[PDB]
Ligand binder design. Structure first.
Ligand SMILES: CSC[C@H]1N[C@@H](c2c[nH]c3c2N=CNC3N)[C@H](O)[C@@H]1O
Ligand SMILES: CSC[C@H]1N[C@@H](c2c[nH]c3c2N=CN[C@H]3N)[C@H](O)[C@@H]1O
Lengths: 231, 231
């Protein structure tokens, strides 16, 4: 873990981390942008992927290729579905899955992309680093568990019920984590997903999201920065 | 266009093209494999993406970045939604959109990734090449129009219903083209999508696909090889 890649979807989700970096250098690939520098004593490349699975996948593949990233950490906001979660709480995604993949017609489990596992496991070392960071993390409650992704912003009770039917133990929902996870799997690169709650993915999710994005972004980022220091 | 990238999801969709190529070198990037050779005095890099949006997007970005591809052509099978489409018929995808993207909560149009256009237009020069290629297959059935993609295999007369609701003029549905399109958009690369019908995306789509993949792959491939010769 020499070079750490950190991927966030939206500017609000990377700004704090960017302000924390030293010797920052802007870099880009077509329309994607990133920032190369250091945090703690670690080389870090912080990328802005844009929203959704294709954007996150391409950005992640780029940083891995271009910078030989040793691991990848996703940061940002998400819909909270876990028992007892509140706005600002952080979830360490120990497993990630696509909630909107369905090739069941050919025998695959719901969410399973053909030729791949149904879920993607975050790296054991990185999970461990995140758990250690949680032990002294004061800004918010932290939990661990499953985060699922798909190419939609979920904002209905019916939408959440669909996802819980396939993923009963789900803790959070968003739109990039499973794409980043699947990309790292395919590129044999360890990763972990860190997200914080901006909403409940329910009928009010869009209204809550815009209000709580900055708080979710910050809490997620502060956890991510603790992890990087520890590596 | 001197270096052409050709992207197919499945071995069966690239096998003929691979056999047509000369001076072929195998290349890889993690679990992704491609073949760099020549076809008709063009440099061709033929990539096996794997199924679905993440896989297609990563393989496409990799080939653009590593090989400096001048354009990208997708080849493969798709479910026929256009009126009258038969197994084996080819669709030149002139426009592409994601059918399963939904950030409508924040005002975006159905299918539209935030900050991206709702649909992605294939390159004019490539579409005209496809149209010339089509005329060389005398009698053959070739149409032009909208192809939509999502991370699921459609095999339901009502799954189709709902797609048609959002995209009335839709001609075909599959799982990679909009990811390739979006990736090319973001990396400023011209592309065109060529697919052939393996099924009608209804309840029999699975058995139709199993039987007619070889046919759809072949017809798509032959069209793509002729397009390469026309650039
Ligand atoms: C503006 S779209 C939502 C962005 N924030 C994340 C997220 C927060 N809350 C939700 C998100 N994604 C889906 N459903 C939700 N309820 C997603 O990963 C997107 O990058
Ligand atoms: C084995 S999954 C189907 C593969 N073939 C394509 C396709 C054929 N027929 C359909 C596909 N995709 C979605 N719905 C369909 N009815 C997709 O792009 C996948 O790569």
């Amino acid at each position: 873990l020499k070079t750490v890649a950190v991927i966030g979807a939206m500017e609000q989700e990377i700004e704090l981390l960017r302000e924390m970096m030293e010797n920052v250098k802007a870099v880009s690939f077509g329309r994607f942008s990133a920032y190369e520098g250091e945090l703690a004593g670690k080389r870090m490349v912080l990328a802005l992927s844009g929203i959704g699975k294709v954007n996150a996948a391409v950005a992640t593949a780029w940083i891995i290729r271009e910078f030989a990233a040793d691991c990848v950490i996703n940061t940002g906001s998400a819909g909270g579905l876990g028992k007892g979660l509140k706005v600002g709480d952080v979830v360490i995604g120990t497993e990630t899955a696509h909630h909107d993949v369905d090739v069941t017609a050919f025998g695959y489990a719901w969410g399973q992309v053909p030729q791949l596992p149904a879920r993607f496991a975050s790296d054991g070392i990185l999970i461990e680093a995140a758990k250690r960071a949680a032990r002294t993390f004061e800004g918010a409650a932290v939990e661990q568990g499953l985060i699922v992704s798909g190419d939609r912003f979920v904002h209905s009770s019916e939408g959440v019920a669909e996802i819980r039917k396939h993923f009963p133990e789900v803790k959070a929902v968003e739109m990039e984590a499973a794409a980043i996870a699947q990309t790292c799997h395919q590129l044999e690169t360890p990763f972990v997903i860190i997200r914080a709650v901006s909403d409940s993915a329910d009928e009010k999710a869009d209204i809550s999201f815009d209000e709580f994005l900055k708080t979710a972004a910050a809490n997620s980022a502060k956890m991510v920065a603790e992890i990087v220091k520890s590596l």
